[PDB]
Design a protein around this motif. Sequence first.
Motif, PDB file in Angstrom:
ATOM      1  N   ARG A 223       0.814  -1.210   0.000  1.00  0.00           N
ATOM      2  CA  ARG A 223       0.000   0.000   0.000  1.00  0.00           C
ATOM      3  C   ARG A 223       0.850   1.263   0.000  1.00  0.00           C
ATOM      4  N   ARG A 226       2.009   1.443  -3.714  1.00  0.00           N
ATOM      5  CA  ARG A 226       0.839   1.832  -4.478  1.00  0.00           C
ATOM      6  C   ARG A 226       0.518   3.293  -4.182  1.00  0.00           C
ATOM      7  N   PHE A 227       0.809   3.747  -2.970  1.00  0.00           N
ATOM      8  CA  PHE A 227       0.587   5.156  -2.673  1.00  0.00           C
ATOM      9  C   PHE A 227       1.702   5.978  -3.321  1.00  0.00           C
ATOM     10  N   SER A 229       3.140   5.467  -6.101  1.00  0.00           N
ATOM     11  CA  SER A 229       2.837   5.561  -7.519  1.00  0.00           C
ATOM     12  C   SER A 229       1.565   6.344  -7.820  1.00  0.00           C
ATOM     13  N   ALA A 230       0.664   6.434  -6.846  1.00  0.00           N
ATOM     14  CA  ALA A 230      -0.623   7.096  -7.056  1.00  0.00           C
ATOM     15  C   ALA A 230      -0.409   8.604  -6.957  1.00  0.00           C
ATOM     16  N   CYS A 231       0.603   8.977  -6.178  1.00  0.00           N
ATOM     17  CA  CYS A 231       1.017  10.356  -6.008  1.00  0.00           C
ATOM     18  C   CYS A 231       1.900  10.802  -7.155  1.00  0.00           C
TER      19      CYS A 231
ATOM     20  N   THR C 114      -6.395   8.911  -0.913  1.00  0.00           N
ATOM     21  CA  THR C 114      -5.409   8.406  -1.870  1.00  0.00           C
ATOM     22  C   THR C 114      -4.812   7.126  -1.294  1.00  0.00           C
ATOM     23  N   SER C 118      -5.526   3.497  -2.927  1.00  0.00           N
ATOM     24  CA  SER C 118      -4.363   3.157  -3.752  1.00  0.00           C
ATOM     25  C   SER C 118      -4.390   3.580  -5.206  1.00  0.00           C
ATOM     26  N   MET C 119      -4.953   4.743  -5.498  1.00  0.00           N
ATOM     27  CA  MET C 119      -4.911   5.303  -6.848  1.00  0.00           C
ATOM     28  C   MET C 119      -5.014   6.822  -6.754  1.00  0.00           C
ATOM     29  N   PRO C 120      -4.755   7.547  -7.845  1.00  0.00           N
ATOM     30  CA  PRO C 120      -4.915   8.999  -7.741  1.00  0.00           C
ATOM     31  C   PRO C 120      -6.309   9.520  -7.348  1.00  0.00           C
TER      32      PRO C 120
END
Lengths: 462, 464, 462, 464
Positions: A223, A226-227, A229-231, C114, C118-120
């Motif tokens: 997580r 994944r966080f 990369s989401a940022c 976020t 786990s995504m934008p």
Amino acid sequence: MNWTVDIPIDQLPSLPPLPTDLRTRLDAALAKPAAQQPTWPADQALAMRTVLESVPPVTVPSEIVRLQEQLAQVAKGEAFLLQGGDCAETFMDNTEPHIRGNVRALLQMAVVLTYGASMPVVKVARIAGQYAKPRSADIDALGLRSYRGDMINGFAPDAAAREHDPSRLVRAYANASAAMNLVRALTSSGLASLHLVHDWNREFVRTSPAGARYEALATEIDRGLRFMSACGVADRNLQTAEIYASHEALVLDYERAMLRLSDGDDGEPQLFDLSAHTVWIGERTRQIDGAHIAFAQVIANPVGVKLGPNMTPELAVEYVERLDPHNKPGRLTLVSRMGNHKVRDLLPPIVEKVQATGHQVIWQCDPMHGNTHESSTGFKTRHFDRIVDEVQGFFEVHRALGTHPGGIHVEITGENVTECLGGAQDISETDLAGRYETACDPRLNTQQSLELAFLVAEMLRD
Amino acid sequence: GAMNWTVDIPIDQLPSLPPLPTDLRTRLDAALAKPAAQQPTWPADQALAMRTVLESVPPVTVPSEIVRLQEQLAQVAKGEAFLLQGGDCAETFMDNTEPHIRGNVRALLQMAVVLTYGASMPVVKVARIAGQYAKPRSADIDALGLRSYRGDMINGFAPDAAAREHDPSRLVRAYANASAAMNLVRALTSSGLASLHLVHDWNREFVRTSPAGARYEALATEIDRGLRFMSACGVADRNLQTAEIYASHEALVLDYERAMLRLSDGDDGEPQLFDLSAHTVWIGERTRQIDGAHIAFAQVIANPVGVKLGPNMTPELAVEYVERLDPHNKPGRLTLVSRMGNHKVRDLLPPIVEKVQATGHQVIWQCDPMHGNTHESSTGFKTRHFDRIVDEVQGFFEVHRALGTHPGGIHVEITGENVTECLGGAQDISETDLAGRYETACDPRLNTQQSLELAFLVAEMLRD
Amino acid sequence: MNWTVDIPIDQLPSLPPLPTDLRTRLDAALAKPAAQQPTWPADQALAMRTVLESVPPVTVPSEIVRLQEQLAQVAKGEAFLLQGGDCAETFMDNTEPHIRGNVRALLQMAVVLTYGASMPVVKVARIAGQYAKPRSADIDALGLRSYRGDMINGFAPDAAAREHDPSRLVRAYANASAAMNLVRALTSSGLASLHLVHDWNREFVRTSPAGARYEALATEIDRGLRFMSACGVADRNLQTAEIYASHEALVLDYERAMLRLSDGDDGEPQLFDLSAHTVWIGERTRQIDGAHIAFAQVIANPVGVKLGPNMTPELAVEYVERLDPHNKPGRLTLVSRMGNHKVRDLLPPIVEKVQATGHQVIWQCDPMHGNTHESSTGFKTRHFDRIVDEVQGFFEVHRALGTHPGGIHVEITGENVTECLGGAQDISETDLAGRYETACDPRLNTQQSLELAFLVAEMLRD
Amino acid sequence: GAMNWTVDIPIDQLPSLPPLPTDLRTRLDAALAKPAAQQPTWPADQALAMRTVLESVPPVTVPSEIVRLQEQLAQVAKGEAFLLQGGDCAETFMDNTEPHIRGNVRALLQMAVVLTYGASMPVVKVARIAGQYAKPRSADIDALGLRSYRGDMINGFAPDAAAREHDPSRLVRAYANASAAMNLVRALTSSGLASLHLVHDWNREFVRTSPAGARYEALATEIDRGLRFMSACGVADRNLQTAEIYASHEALVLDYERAMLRLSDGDDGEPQLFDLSAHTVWIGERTRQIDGAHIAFAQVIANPVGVKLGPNMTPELAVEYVERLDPHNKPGRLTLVSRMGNHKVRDLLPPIVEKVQATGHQVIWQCDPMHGNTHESSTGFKTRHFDRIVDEVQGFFEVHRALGTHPGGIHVEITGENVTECLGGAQDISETDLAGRYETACDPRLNTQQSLELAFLVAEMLRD
Ligand SMILES: [Cl-]
Ligand SMILES: [Cl-]
Ligand SMILES: [Mn+2]
Ligand SMILES: [Mn+2]
Ligand SMILES: [Mn+2]
Ligand SMILES: [Mn+2]
């Protein structure tokens, strides 16, 4: 007729000598007695060093001054050191799959330890040169001269293989160079990618029997990523993996043959050992007035000293005076290896007295070497549980004191070996005969070395 | 045995390796069973022993770096990047040293910044290095009566019979040396030596200490104002991506290339054989027999490959090489390397290029202006005039402008040392001067100074 | 003598007209009936629109095509939408502290959502123009014409303030522009910094009474961030915060006065409403053959439609046909607002039928508007618990169906207001009189809106 | 009241705001109690009402952007960046429109890329925009007999008495307009308009459609090869940092600047008053009385400030302005803006510069070549010859080279429109041409074309 090929060592013209002043200093330092040295004749050794004085280095000075700045962070309590790889590299296994497996293992430990410590992890491979070891007896169980590592003699158990041949000096250089070549390629490849690396951690958690125990941390780290990369972080935004080479500096003919002088563009020429980025002196070769300590004094590389149960606070302060005379944070690492029954009692007064010198060393834990024992079934082994308990005790002393548990130093492989006892898989005394592959000490295997990372992570989170 | 000045390697405890996919095995054996020009004449059994030692060593290059090279060469092939290939004619074991390697790398980075500025597009940098240790020879006996020097993978430069025997132990020494050098070039390209800004102050020492300096000054000043503009807009060293220099050599000694084959994993399609002795390899004018092993071997490996094309080349055989070596129409898989002579490139290249362009494949067109312009001096040494090399490249450019195709790159023989091998340049190296510092083990290389002076000259052909 | 200042509206020369074709189309569309429109005379309205046709826009076309690409991600299930801010912005409170407080609140929700999704997270402020609202009665409790938002009349409860004055059109533009100016400055400032933002989340967890409940997630997110930074990400590596302006498109004289044509450099000119980035049509003004739907059809901006309990699958398909005729993912958001007792039963057949059209809309939850009620103590309120349960039910329908709960749409403030009931603080009916400050509906306050983020996060993690 | 063409704002429910730190209050009242030249003559009570409306509106700028401007100006002050300041002489409410704002922004970005390339260092970009709505006047009655136009913050351009009354309602209209424009410039500078590559193809249209085009071509081609070199080395738009254009105006109307004061938080030291009407403001030749309110007010705000210095300036008074306005020796806090005339800058500036350099403070030296070079044409309009402006800047540069100080920047009056306000340029705008498109509300601005032609001219002074 004997399944051997002879490769001529090329007799090539020399480059200029190192400057005479530094030579004068190096000579003064290597007139000191040197323990554990091969017994080959001087003329052959001389000849083989002359070959190595002109070969392309394994490392270059800028990487080493970079390692020095990363280690200062560690010494100041804002980065953690991970050092790990084969107990002994052999030439036979210096292969892409084995090298790739140890590099993976290490990057795998690294992301877990990074999450858990919440600070950078500096990664130092025992690799590209860990081909020499001491011995306490010159006679082994088979009534032969002892194996002393591939830079010196052969593991096969016969007389001819066990003689000390200095042509192994140039064989070591070659294997070191080829291994180094491959670790630079693999660390600029997809192998280094954080996302990749910890999907291995997730295959680990599925397939391991203590898997339920580590799921939570594994999911959290996941997580985390994944966080990232989401940022909007993608892998080209991180700047790439840096894995440094280290080995024990044991064989002075090799280490001094690999001395070079730096550009003098950086600023100020000085002697670097370009066989590796950082090296350590072992417990059998760290005599205060010996050739190994003197040699470490003369080289710019960061160095480490293995400190065992016989160590005194006063000998430790002398190491600091000898090896960090300018007070440079992270120039000296002191490596605790005491046994898990002893670290809680023995380490503390060593730390107190060194912390009072005003110098900033890195305190690193070696939870392997103090905790070895022989099983009823013949093999030399270590108990995973005792290894864990030693890191635990080392963290407890540092907490109690307010100093920084700076890192660990471990013998590990990416192979699925059966050398150390217990772990999630509880490898027993019976299981040791299945895949006992070490040329020397028992390595944590891929699963165990990972499990230890998880466990050290929870330690860093308390 | 340091007593016998040998390193002793046992083969018997080298443990069996995974078998190849059945078709890949069939195709490899098929390629290597075809006739092969210019191979060493050493025993099959000694070779085999040495091949087996090399089957298990660490590769010089890994597949991901080769797929990445293909993508960069794709761009050159589409007219949006430029190819720089350069280094020793023949690397020797004797000069495989830090200073020599570092000079070569410098000279390449230096040329590359100049060429980047003149092209207004990316320059891919491919060194002749870490394995360019074999050469063909048109005659097996040389002017001294001796079996010919075939490069350090095969025999020794020393002018005596015994050094001239073909020695398969050289296959492992060639690898050791190749590994060692690649390790160093990787170390160098992610150090301060690669920073574009340092790299171009060398070019400015060059402009000031040079007889033709007044000629190249304006363009050196322009490049410098380029670099500072870049930095003034906030671009710092670490905002760039560090330098990538790829390894290449002639793929000549099939014993070496086959022992260095490896099979790629699952994470990029069906498995494929890569030649891990290098990033890209080429096939020379003497070994490029259409039905021979070199061509056949090129078709089994996944690496980008090149093929040299000299003055007896036809448009029809060029097309045949493209359909054989780039059968999937993958741009940048194939470079065609033209080496015609400056007095012939203007007339012989255009029809080779029209016919290739008509196929719909996208080859990189690269100019080798070295190998068609060699003569023997009146003093004793074989040499090339700098003006002829320049002119070939000039003509190579006129060919492509006039057709509207892409002059895709140059392939040059250069060194970081001021040898005195090539006549002319700003230095006007005479026949008499050639005795001074003639050091090559084969062809005459351009000087440090001449190889730079040529980047400037091509950078201006790129600007017109 | 009455504590008022009169600011002359400057009568400035016009720029060229919009092209005649698009004008012909826009005119055809606004001949349709329009509900809820102010009752000011045409000449004054005409006059005030002419002033607004030449003023600098609030947004520009490139930001809107950027918002469109981010929303397509959301519609494809790879990004989540957060939309939130005042129920009604008033001019009086369009101040730096209040604007800064709502921007903070939103970025604070965003990092929590976020991590949890786990995504934008695409962030859309109800701001820089939410100055108009419907009403069901033209007569309020005080026997006055209803307050209809500051773009139309005054909140003060007297006749003179409640008349519809079109000079509020230009007052709205001004306040919108000044507010926008400030949200662009604050989103390129240290205010946007992930590390900052979630140290507020940590002050929240210390001081809140349900704090123990959220500590774990708060610590995890923290470690997430510390891990980002340990891996070498610093704030200049992220590319900066993007907070988009939205409001309900209610007052057609304002929205059409703010129409512009795009460069035609992007490629192809077209009409954009440059009063905001995205706008929505409300439940009272979404008549299928009405002027609001027609107007949304003509503008390039992403749009949303509020769907209540009376909604049919068949009316929803018509919205999709009307508002996404080209099948562009994220052009249309459908906003569920049904009540927590009804969403589980009523939403599902709406989704099934829209998913079968082959179009890709964003399904967003509005858990506020369906769940309002009046307390025994006079004030109009909502139960936090019912709000939560509505998001819960919306997630359950999407899971059951395999579609994507795309986001939420919430009325929140950074103020410590006492408008909505319950939450960790269990604001009671008694507590509502302390800080009841909304010009319209009850807003979740700073603490509650954060708590809801945590709770929606745990929903996204299941 | 849209009936009365007014917007009605009530003051009574504007709720009391935190009191200032006691010393800051004392110093502010102290500064504003000092005599103040060139203030409007409107009633104290109406002013107060309007100040109170502006005390609670959203700021035009925030403190973090001002601290960031100081760091960038520090660099200019140390000789490692360059300052570009430009825009309308007088912004009017009438042309505060997207097209006009966008033209102005473009013209500035366009000049700035050229100046960046010529300077080989960063250019800080400060627009005269979002508040430059007030001007001094040496006479209260103009040539028509009317009370003088003082800019749209104060009265109206219309030549009638009633438009000429001073109207405090203009303080709030000036803010509305200032907000609205700043909102748009922030939108523009983080769009494609700011990408350096587009921004310089405008300069190439300019070179081709221009009577002096053959003059500026080589340098335009060089800049372009700069930009493509940058991109070829892997630098993409999003690897850069997006454009920052700062707002500035003359700090003239103390009613406006004081209502726009705000107090900064804890997260950067002790709290300080910032003028949030702009990023940086300057003080003009007429309001720079050493013991007056403008100077006194400059000393209380944290923003970078400038001070104009004309031909009756002494080295001694310049030193006094530096010790008063940069008392902490903070580089870039203070710019000294020289505006001497081209016939005087060569002789009058050097001694002002020697004495300032001797203090040990680091001011930015900036050239305003507009305001000392104004004449009245024979046709009716007041104008400036392009050659005189150029020459002043030329001389400003000779002053600094000869002392080895930093020519730190220029402060120009420009517009994105091809007005015909300034004589000469490549267009050779004559006296006769001036009637065509004379649109300024005060001073003659440089053309779109003239303002570019001047970037090219200064970029070459930077190169020598
Ligand atoms: Cl065979
Ligand atoms: Cl007052
Ligand atoms: Mn060991
Ligand atoms: Mn050659
Ligand atoms: Mn509401
Ligand atoms: Mn002016």
